RNA sequence: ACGAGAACAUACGUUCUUUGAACCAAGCUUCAACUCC
């Protein structure tokens, strides 16, 4: 199981509800949406969907990482038992569990001027990473196709505010074996690592002793082909990445657009870190 | 088929107005056109 490390040399804007604020990381269907839009840039979008639909391409979402420390969101248990301010724990320090600051959020103030009229300002929330940090994306069984797409994505930009002028990155794989054995392990409680949602006939079996938050996950369709306007998406509600489940489930790539000239998918497949 | 798409933090605006590098202060003090043969 491989690593995908993302080094940003420019600020990022990962919006979650509005342009004025931003988020440290980006989700999994955000990266999958970027890969779909770039694959239909290359025309190979159909067999990329047939790869990601049949589990050979299965990635988690982005996580913070500092120099030789890979992080995850604080897994949230039914713990009966200060470190309550900390949002991220190192990925190998879960056994110890049972200082940290990457970057700083900034707000960039912009304007749009009209020539024979008064101007109008708008402001963009940004995030800038420190010099020896960034984000990393977990992936198992790397494919030549996704190695080609991320090689091609880095000149289009992950992030929100494009193409002015923020999201750009250079990636490298840099596989690791100190944390592959964590994912080869098996335990009794399995934490989630991506924004996921089980299929309708297994949500009950997935929902037994869980600890989760829903997140709304919608927005606008970003294409020049979906139905001659800016149509919103069917707001899918997926589990938060810092969830825990005692029993596993497998997600689906749900179609959240069913009215334009092409389908709009949303990645909601599961990715577990099994722990005792 | 990225809470996304499109968007100059832009337009206007004299580091400027008033202000003697001035005031006070002897080119002066002491000296033989001279001594010797």
UniProtKB/TrEMBL annotation:
Q: Which domain of life is it from?
A: Bacteria
Q: Which residues form the Csm4 C-terminal domain?
A: 186-275
Q: Which GO terms describe its biological process?
A: defense response to virus
InterPro entries the record matches: Csm4, Csm4_C, RAMP_III_fam
UniProt KW keywords: Antiviral defense, Plasmid, RNA-binding
State whether keyword Repeat applies. no
Q: List residues of the CRISPR type III-associated protein domain.
A: 56-170
Instruction: Please provide, alphabetically and separated by semicolons, the GO molecular function terms listed in this UniProt record.
Output: RNA binding
Q: Is RNA-binding one of the keywords?
A: yes
The record's similarity note reads: Belongs to the CRISPR-associated Csm4 family.
Quote the protein name from its UniProt record. Answer: CRISPR system Cms protein Csm4
């Amino acid at each position: 199981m491989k690593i995908i490390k993302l080094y940003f040399e420019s600020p990022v804007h990962f919006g979650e509800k509005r342009l004025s604020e931003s988020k440290i990381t980006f989700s999994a269907d955000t990266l999958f949406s970027a890969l779909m839009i770039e694959a239909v840039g290359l025309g190979k979008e159909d067999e990329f969907y047939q790869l990601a639909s049949n589990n050979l391409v299965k990635f988690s979402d982005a996580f913070p990482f500092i120099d030789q420390y890979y992080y995850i969101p604080k897994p949230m248990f039914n713990l009966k038992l200060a470190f309550k301010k900390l949002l991220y724990v190192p990925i190998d320090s879960l056994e110890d569990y049972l200082s940290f600051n990457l970057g700083k959020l900034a707000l960039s103030e912009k304007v749009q001027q009209h020539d024979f009229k008064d101007s109008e300002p708008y402001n963009v929330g940004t995030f800038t990473f420190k010099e020896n940090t960034g984000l990393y994306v977990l992936i198992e069984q790397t494919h030549p196709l996704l190695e080609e797409l991320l090689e091609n994505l880095q000149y289009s930009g992950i992030g929100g505010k494009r193409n002015s002028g923020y999201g750009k990155f250079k990636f490298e794989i840099l596989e690791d074996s100190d944390i592959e054995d964590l994912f080869s392990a098996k335990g009794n409680r399995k934490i989630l690592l991506s924004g996921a949602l089980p299929k309708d006939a297994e949500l009950e079996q997935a929902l037994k002793n869980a600890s989760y938050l829903l997140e709304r996950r919608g927005g606008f369709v970003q294409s020049d082909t979906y139905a001659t306007n800016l149509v919103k998406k069917q707001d899918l509600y997926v589990f938060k990445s810092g969830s825990t489940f005692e029993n596993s489930f497998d997600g689906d790539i749900y179609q959240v657009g069913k009215k334009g000239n092409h389908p709009v998918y949303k990645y909601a497949k599961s990715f577990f870190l099994e722990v005792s």
